[PDB]
Amino acid sequence: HMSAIKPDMKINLRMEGNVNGHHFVIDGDGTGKPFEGKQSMDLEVKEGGPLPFAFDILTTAFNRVFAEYPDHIQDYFKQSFPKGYSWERSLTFEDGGICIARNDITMEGDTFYNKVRFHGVNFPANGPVMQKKTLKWEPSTEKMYVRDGVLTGDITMALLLEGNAHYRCDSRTTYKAKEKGVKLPGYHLVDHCIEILSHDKDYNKVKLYEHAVAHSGLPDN
Amino acid sequence: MSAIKPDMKINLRMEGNVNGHHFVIDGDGTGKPFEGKQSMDLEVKEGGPLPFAFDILTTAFNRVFAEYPDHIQDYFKQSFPKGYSWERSLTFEDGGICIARNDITMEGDTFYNKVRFHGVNFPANGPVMQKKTLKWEPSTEKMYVRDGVLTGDITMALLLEGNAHYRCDSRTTYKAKEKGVKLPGYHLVDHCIEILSHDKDYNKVKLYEHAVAHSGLPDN
Amino acid sequence: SAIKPDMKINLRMEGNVNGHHFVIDGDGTGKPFEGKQSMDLEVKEGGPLPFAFDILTTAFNRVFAEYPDHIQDYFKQSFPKGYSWERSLTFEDGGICIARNDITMEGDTFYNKVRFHGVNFPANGPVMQKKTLKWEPSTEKMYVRDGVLTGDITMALLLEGNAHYRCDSRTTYKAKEKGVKLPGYHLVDHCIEILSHDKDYNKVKLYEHAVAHSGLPDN
Amino acid sequence: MSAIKPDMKINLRMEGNVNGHHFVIDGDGTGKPFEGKQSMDLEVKEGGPLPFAFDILTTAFNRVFAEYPDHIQDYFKQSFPKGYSWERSLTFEDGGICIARNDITMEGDTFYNKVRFHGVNFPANGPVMQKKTLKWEPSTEKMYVRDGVLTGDITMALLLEGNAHYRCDSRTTYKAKEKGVKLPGYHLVDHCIEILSHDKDYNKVKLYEHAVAHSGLPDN
């Protein structure tokens, strides 16, 4: 239908979560261009700071409506508004650390609202996360498809570590629309790149940016 | 002057969210720490009736209730009266993943458990959302130290109607709250857990568990 | 190089999946610098295969990837002495495959000795029941772990009725000669296709196109 | 008139490759199936000496030698004179991934095993390639039926030099050569395996394993 999505969107996000027995609340004002698949956010930890973990593991939980979609790819995400949609996500890191995240997404005019939740367990004390040895998320490629009838995305992720070592994480998100009638898209790919643009010593304030582009792979891309 | 007594009470509240259905469950239990045997009556206070298999939360309803033999260090009875806390991951073969955690404390003859539980990515047509589970099969927990921390891994299996099984890998880390508590060597904990009875919609459940720690073959 | 812009390809695989043994020969031709290669495969032994042919197909040389100038090309750098890989394919339903290929080049031809071993596919899975359609296009991630080039992939077989069958690959790349320069983190896009086949895939014509890039926001 | 005797011989030859290194290990030993014990002296005919920890081949060297109680259907002993076969995947925590196979048959009082074994992606600096393993810890195989086939999953751990552990998940699929043989229901199989003896190079090795099957708690 007609979406309600206009090319400059405000972004309003709200995260509550616990890693390793440590609670934190974080807020973010942000703005974006859904149709260019770009956005940036100003996160500010409202409780639980300084976080004793790496802020990087939180970042992808900070909306694939901001994915530049070609018209030969069904945009399950933009066609899900006004009503909106919600995702669930597991992150499984290679040292048995595992997070689950939920984000539920609505729209009040020029603004997306995100009630996000984040939980992480089993991070080992001398690992990259708890010792905060992380540098950035490398550029990834999300594999999009339908299983048991739900748009699913899997990703093979890797965090750059000091020493230019890499820390592997597997990602699986399930997206569900709030409204009936949303066409399921054929299998596709979504390149992204996420980025901490600026940040203070303790990470209590953070500038985040993301660029996500959908494509069919080779070749034709 | 022991912190652990032969007949103990168990007081628990869990709060969780699986597939986005919120819930709070409360349990009122009794145990025999030295016999590794305990039972519990749980009543759902919010979220009833639960739209997923009650079974998935049951191991998240305390290893002080294991019978430990003298030749295996008993970390959990050693962690009291101050307490301890576990974090747990449950990874289901169909994408089902839960994380959970329990902070156990003690007042006199009573354990106080604050428990959380979050489950994502269970399919609509799987054994959990369809409520086809009957019971956790009796299982063996592998206990070992990794990075300063007591850790158990378990190959779990949920028995289903039609008698197929449905697999879960669990990892649990246990952390004493007081310093200095001595880490056990490598060992095994035998478990069996059961819903003795329940009301139709699982708003009231009586749970029972039994765990016995051992060293395996060939000394058992 | 001495890797020519038009290479020929000599393949020879020997395999065993679910205790079914097979031997498969393939000869083809390539445009290494364009990142493209097709091959005519023939099952010399153990056919008609009791399982989906697609699972063997990535087992049928990253040297055929278009590498841009800002990315180290480990694979063409490894020649003319060559390189090797072991790979593991972990499928969602417990089915596991491992593969190895030694890749040598004498003259204008690449030679591959390729091994491939599969265990624990369920009797009624998409693999033993032949319900696979094609691999979907993919995107290998290349990084270094413990001084060895590694490429991990989120793979997915398209099946009958458009369902998918997930698979996770890990591949480790080892240059033959010492101290060949390890590349920085990067991606290869892939697309592999059976172009045509006969009834029981005793005869198979394959194509693959790989392009290396450093991801957004550049690619 | 039962096929299996209380004192069998074992003839086993293995062919294998880990990390591009080929090898052949031949074997000769004995054991008591109804007791669930066996032992064998293993000779490296080729590939020797072996770069990698010898322990990772050890479980790949027959559940016939498992002690089953009358209340559990013994799939393996009900497989013979015809015999049975297994496939194995070993998935190590640091990316190392093994797959193995064996066809077990019988000729008189001898079991004959054709063992294949292939490990890939073991990190040059790991305990595997660096040979810092000491032993497998005692374990418990979880036996159940998937798609009509006997499948046992294990939570394995290697003890390494320095009191650390190395984790490995096992999945084995068991298939009789004979039609009809009836599958048991869920059970546990306690294992313990031991290099009893070996030369500095590990080209000659004496092995011992002990298997006992049971219903787990509280029926053990």
mmCIF file of N, CA and C in Angstrom, chain D residues 148-208:
data_model
loop_
_atom_site.group_PDB
_atom_site.id
_atom_site.type_symbol
_atom_site.label_atom_id
_atom_site.label_comp_id
_atom_site.label_asym_id
_atom_site.label_seq_id
_atom_site.Cartn_x
_atom_site.Cartn_y
_atom_site.Cartn_z
ATOM 1 N N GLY D 148 14.110 -42.908 12.252
ATOM 2 C CA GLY D 148 14.210 -44.357 12.196
ATOM 3 C C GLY D 148 15.596 -44.934 12.442
ATOM 4 N N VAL D 149 16.515 -44.102 12.915
ATOM 5 C CA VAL D 149 17.898 -44.528 13.085
ATOM 6 C C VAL D 149 18.428 -44.245 14.490
ATOM 7 N N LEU D 150 19.102 -45.230 15.077
ATOM 8 C CA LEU D 150 19.690 -45.041 16.408
ATOM 9 C C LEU D 150 20.766 -43.967 16.396
ATOM 10 N N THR D 151 20.550 -42.936 17.202
ATOM 11 C CA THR D 151 21.488 -41.827 17.250
ATOM 12 C C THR D 151 21.901 -41.531 18.686
ATOM 13 N N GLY D 152 23.209 -41.473 18.915
ATOM 14 C CA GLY D 152 23.732 -41.118 20.224
ATOM 15 C C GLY D 152 24.541 -39.831 20.183
ATOM 16 N N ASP D 153 24.140 -38.866 21.010
ATOM 17 C CA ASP D 153 24.860 -37.611 21.189
ATOM 18 C C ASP D 153 25.682 -37.596 22.487
ATOM 19 N N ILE D 154 26.912 -37.082 22.421
ATOM 20 C CA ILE D 154 27.776 -36.996 23.604
ATOM 21 C C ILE D 154 28.319 -35.581 23.870
ATOM 22 N N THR D 155 28.418 -35.220 25.155
ATOM 23 C CA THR D 155 29.100 -33.995 25.578
ATOM 24 C C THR D 155 30.521 -34.343 26.030
ATOM 25 N N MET D 156 31.472 -34.313 25.094
ATOM 26 C CA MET D 156 32.827 -34.806 25.365
ATOM 27 C C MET D 156 33.751 -33.708 25.894
ATOM 28 N N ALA D 157 34.744 -34.085 26.690
ATOM 29 C CA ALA D 157 35.788 -33.141 27.078
ATOM 30 C C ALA D 157 37.145 -33.811 27.105
ATOM 31 N N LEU D 158 38.136 -33.117 26.550
ATOM 32 C CA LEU D 158 39.515 -33.567 26.605
ATOM 33 C C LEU D 158 40.202 -32.849 27.759
ATOM 34 N N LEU D 159 40.974 -33.580 28.550
ATOM 35 C CA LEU D 159 41.821 -32.916 29.530
ATOM 36 C C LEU D 159 43.143 -32.553 28.865
ATOM 37 N N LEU D 160 43.536 -31.286 28.980
ATOM 38 C CA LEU D 160 44.760 -30.806 28.336
ATOM 39 C C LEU D 160 45.849 -30.586 29.372
ATOM 40 N N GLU D 161 47.094 -30.462 28.922
ATOM 41 C CA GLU D 161 48.170 -30.103 29.835
ATOM 42 C C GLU D 161 47.797 -28.786 30.491
ATOM 43 N N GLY D 162 47.881 -28.742 31.820
ATOM 44 C CA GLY D 162 47.599 -27.529 32.561
ATOM 45 C C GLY D 162 46.209 -27.463 33.165
ATOM 46 N N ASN D 163 45.566 -28.621 33.305
ATOM 47 C CA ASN D 163 44.262 -28.740 33.978
ATOM 48 C C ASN D 163 43.087 -28.074 33.268
ATOM 49 N N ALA D 164 43.303 -27.603 32.038
ATOM 50 C CA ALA D 164 42.223 -27.067 31.211
ATOM 51 C C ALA D 164 41.485 -28.179 30.472
ATOM 52 N N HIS D 165 40.298 -27.882 29.948
ATOM 53 C CA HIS D 165 39.561 -28.873 29.166
ATOM 54 C C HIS D 165 39.363 -28.403 27.733
ATOM 55 N N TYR D 166 39.043 -29.350 26.861
ATOM 56 C CA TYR D 166 38.800 -29.085 25.450
ATOM 57 C C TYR D 166 37.522 -29.810 25.078
ATOM 58 N N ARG D 167 36.551 -29.069 24.570
ATOM 59 C CA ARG D 167 35.206 -29.596 24.433
ATOM 60 C C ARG D 167 34.924 -30.123 23.035
ATOM 61 N N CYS D 168 34.071 -31.140 22.955
ATOM 62 C CA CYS D 168 33.742 -31.767 21.691
ATOM 63 C C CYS D 168 32.364 -32.416 21.767
ATOM 64 N N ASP D 169 31.493 -32.032 20.843
ATOM 65 C CA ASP D 169 30.193 -32.664 20.694
ATOM 66 C C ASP D 169 30.224 -33.758 19.656
ATOM 67 N N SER D 170 29.623 -34.875 20.025
ATOM 68 C CA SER D 170 29.691 -36.075 19.236
ATOM 69 C C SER D 170 28.281 -36.376 18.786
ATOM 70 N N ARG D 171 28.134 -36.813 17.546
ATOM 71 C CA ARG D 171 26.892 -37.427 17.132
ATOM 72 C C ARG D 171 27.226 -38.634 16.291
ATOM 73 N N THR D 172 26.676 -39.768 16.694
ATOM 74 C CA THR D 172 26.906 -41.020 16.006
ATOM 75 C C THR D 172 25.559 -41.541 15.541
ATOM 76 N N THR D 173 25.505 -42.042 14.307
ATOM 77 C CA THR D 173 24.301 -42.712 13.805
ATOM 78 C C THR D 173 24.583 -44.201 13.659
ATOM 79 N N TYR D 174 23.726 -45.028 14.261
ATOM 80 C CA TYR D 174 23.893 -46.484 14.221
ATOM 81 C C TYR D 174 22.864 -47.122 13.287
ATOM 82 N N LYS D 175 23.337 -48.005 12.411
ATOM 83 C CA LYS D 175 22.476 -48.685 11.456
ATOM 84 C C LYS D 175 22.828 -50.170 11.339
ATOM 85 N N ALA D 176 21.911 -51.044 11.739
ATOM 86 C CA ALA D 176 22.128 -52.478 11.567
ATOM 87 C C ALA D 176 22.281 -52.809 10.082
ATOM 88 N N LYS D 177 22.950 -53.914 9.785
ATOM 89 C CA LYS D 177 22.990 -54.399 8.419
ATOM 90 C C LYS D 177 21.669 -55.105 8.165
ATOM 91 N N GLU D 178 21.059 -55.605 9.227
ATOM 92 C CA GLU D 178 19.825 -56.338 9.034
ATOM 93 C C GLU D 178 18.564 -55.507 9.184
ATOM 94 N N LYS D 179 17.647 -55.755 8.247
ATOM 95 C CA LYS D 179 16.254 -55.362 8.340
ATOM 96 C C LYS D 179 15.666 -55.798 9.683
ATOM 97 N N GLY D 180 14.568 -55.174 10.084
ATOM 98 C CA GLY D 180 13.824 -55.655 11.226
ATOM 99 C C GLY D 180 14.362 -55.292 12.596
ATOM 100 N N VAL D 181 15.675 -55.371 12.815
ATOM 101 C CA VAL D 181 16.181 -55.176 14.176
ATOM 102 C C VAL D 181 15.495 -53.985 14.849
ATOM 103 N N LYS D 182 14.893 -54.233 16.003
ATOM 104 C CA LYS D 182 14.057 -53.224 16.643
ATOM 105 C C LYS D 182 14.876 -52.245 17.467
ATOM 106 N N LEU D 183 14.618 -50.965 17.224
ATOM 107 C CA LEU D 183 15.241 -49.866 17.954
ATOM 108 C C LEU D 183 14.794 -49.814 19.424
ATOM 109 N N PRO D 184 15.749 -49.576 20.343
ATOM 110 C CA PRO D 184 15.413 -49.318 21.750
ATOM 111 C C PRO D 184 14.829 -47.916 21.887
ATOM 112 N N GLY D 185 14.318 -47.583 23.072
ATOM 113 C CA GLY D 185 13.932 -46.228 23.419
ATOM 114 C C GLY D 185 15.082 -45.550 24.145
ATOM 115 N N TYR D 186 14.901 -44.278 24.504
ATOM 116 C CA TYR D 186 15.980 -43.443 25.041
ATOM 117 C C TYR D 186 16.753 -44.097 26.168
ATOM 118 N N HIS D 187 18.066 -44.180 25.987
ATOM 119 C CA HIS D 187 18.949 -44.536 27.090
ATOM 120 C C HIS D 187 20.292 -43.813 27.076
ATOM 121 N N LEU D 188 21.013 -43.983 28.184
ATOM 122 C CA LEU D 188 22.311 -43.375 28.417
ATOM 123 C C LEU D 188 23.351 -44.472 28.377
ATOM 124 N N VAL D 189 24.538 -44.160 27.859
ATOM 125 C CA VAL D 189 25.641 -45.117 27.882
ATOM 126 C C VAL D 189 26.892 -44.495 28.492
ATOM 127 N N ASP D 190 27.237 -44.894 29.718
ATOM 128 C CA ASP D 190 28.429 -44.338 30.362
ATOM 129 C C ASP D 190 29.687 -44.913 29.731
ATOM 130 N N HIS D 191 30.567 -44.034 29.253
ATOM 131 C CA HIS D 191 31.866 -44.436 28.699
ATOM 132 C C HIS D 191 33.044 -43.981 29.519
ATOM 133 N N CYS D 192 34.139 -44.709 29.364
ATOM 134 C CA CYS D 192 35.444 -44.273 29.833
ATOM 135 C C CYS D 192 36.486 -45.014 29.019
ATOM 136 N N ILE D 193 37.433 -44.260 28.470
ATOM 137 C CA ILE D 193 38.418 -44.811 27.558
ATOM 138 C C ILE D 193 39.814 -44.371 27.988
ATOM 139 N N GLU D 194 40.790 -45.225 27.764
ATOM 140 C CA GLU D 194 42.086 -44.930 28.319
ATOM 141 C C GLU D 194 43.171 -45.467 27.436
ATOM 142 N N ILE D 195 44.117 -44.597 27.092
ATOM 143 C CA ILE D 195 45.402 -45.043 26.612
ATOM 144 C C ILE D 195 46.088 -45.690 27.812
ATOM 145 N N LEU D 196 46.247 -47.006 27.769
ATOM 146 C CA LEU D 196 46.865 -47.711 28.883
ATOM 147 C C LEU D 196 48.381 -47.612 28.810
ATOM 148 N N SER D 197 48.902 -47.456 27.593
ATOM 149 C CA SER D 197 50.345 -47.497 27.343
ATOM 150 C C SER D 197 50.671 -47.008 25.929
ATOM 151 N N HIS D 198 51.887 -46.494 25.745
ATOM 152 C CA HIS D 198 52.298 -45.936 24.458
ATOM 153 C C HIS D 198 53.785 -45.544 24.439
ATOM 154 N N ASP D 199 54.419 -45.636 23.267
ATOM 155 C CA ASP D 199 55.792 -45.141 23.107
ATOM 156 C C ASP D 199 55.861 -43.627 22.834
ATOM 157 N N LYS D 200 57.026 -43.026 23.074
ATOM 158 C CA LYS D 200 57.155 -41.571 23.045
ATOM 159 C C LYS D 200 56.540 -40.961 21.788
ATOM 160 N N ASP D 201 56.554 -41.726 20.700
ATOM 161 C CA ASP D 201 56.065 -41.280 19.394
ATOM 162 C C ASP D 201 54.573 -41.555 19.192
ATOM 163 N N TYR D 202 54.026 -42.483 19.971
ATOM 164 C CA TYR D 202 52.620 -42.877 19.856
ATOM 165 C C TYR D 202 52.325 -43.766 18.642
ATOM 166 N N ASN D 203 53.370 -44.317 18.033
ATOM 167 C CA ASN D 203 53.201 -45.294 16.956
ATOM 168 C C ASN D 203 52.632 -46.639 17.449
ATOM 169 N N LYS D 204 52.882 -46.963 18.715
ATOM 170 C CA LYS D 204 52.285 -48.123 19.383
ATOM 171 C C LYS D 204 51.512 -47.659 20.605
ATOM 172 N N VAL D 205 50.255 -48.089 20.700
ATOM 173 C CA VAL D 205 49.344 -47.628 21.744
ATOM 174 C C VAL D 205 48.410 -48.754 22.207
ATOM 175 N N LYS D 206 48.254 -48.898 23.525
ATOM 176 C CA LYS D 206 47.312 -49.847 24.101
ATOM 177 C C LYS D 206 46.097 -49.112 24.651
ATOM 178 N N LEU D 207 44.917 -49.543 24.224
ATOM 179 C CA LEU D 207 43.690 -48.795 24.487
ATOM 180 C C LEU D 207 42.736 -49.636 25.323
ATOM 181 N N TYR D 208 41.915 -48.977 26.130
ATOM 182 C CA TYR D 208 40.930 -49.662 26.960
ATOM 183 C C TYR D 208 39.682 -48.797 27.096
#
